[PDB]
Amino acid sequence: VHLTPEEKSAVTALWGKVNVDEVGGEALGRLLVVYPWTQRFFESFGDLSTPDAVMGNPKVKAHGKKVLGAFSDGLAHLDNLKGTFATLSELHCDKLHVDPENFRLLGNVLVCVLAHHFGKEFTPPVQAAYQKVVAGVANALAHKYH
């Protein structure tokens, strides 16, 4: 992913303020609520029967934290996303068989959550930079499919 130095600074500045305890869980949570079929991959997570149940689910929050952590690592290795996510790609593609379209969906949900948390600070230019990142992460996750 190619980010101008200005975009890099804006992305980093915003990411540094992200609530690492909640953002990831809210993104994963909204994915499960907005795209119900994704719930089939989390049978062991317990209660996902209602939106409130999904969002407040401790396992969803914990796992979402790992997801956010994965995005955080991608931001630190934008020059080598394929290598950084090699292991995760094998897991999601070869083992879980997650359809690629879903990687894109989660990426955009994360973008919606960032917009939700930062409001006006999440400007169109900031979003544009983040779309490059999530697209890059999504691509890397699905590379074992290629």
Binding site: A115, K120, F122
Partner: protein
């Protein structure tokens, strides 16, 4: 297919836009043009520079069209026939682009109406926009 709950969620959320129609519509477009440059090829005759008057005016048309769609949520194919002729028959817009604008509309709503953008409401809005998208990309006349 929208549930009775989806319809009331959309009416309540979009109803908050009010006088911000043009502002939000313009912003959603600006977000789309900047985030997904390829979408700009459908507006070659437009002045797409940030804050252009043409985009502001067009953003208003898009926003108002959505307001009309909300009002005719139970008969969109009929109420949106004219827009379908434009987007499906004349412009032949690829459906992927509707997904992009829909996403940018959700982002705009999340950034301006945090209290309205709950997980359930977010779900309803996505379904709603996907519905509008299907009508606009289908040739049914």
């Amino acid at each position: 297919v929208l549930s009775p709950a989806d319809k009331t969620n959309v009416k309540a959320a979009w109803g908050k836009v009010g006088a911000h129609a043009g502002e939000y519509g313009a912003e959603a477009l600006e977000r789309m043009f900047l985030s997904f440059p390829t979408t700009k090829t459908y507006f070659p005759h437009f002045d797409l520079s940030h804050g252009s008057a043409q985009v502001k005016g067009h953003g208003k048309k898009v926003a108002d069209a959505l307001t009309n769609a909300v009002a005719h949520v139970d008969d969109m194919p009929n109420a949106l026939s004219a827009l379908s002729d434009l987007h499906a028959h004349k412009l032949r817009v690829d459906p992927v682009n509707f997904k992009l604008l829909s996403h940018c509309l959700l982002v705009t709503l999340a950034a301006h109406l945090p209290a309205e953008f709950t997980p359930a409401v977010h779900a309803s809005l996505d379904k709603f926009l996907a519905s509008v998208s299907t009508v606009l990309t289908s040739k049914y006349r």
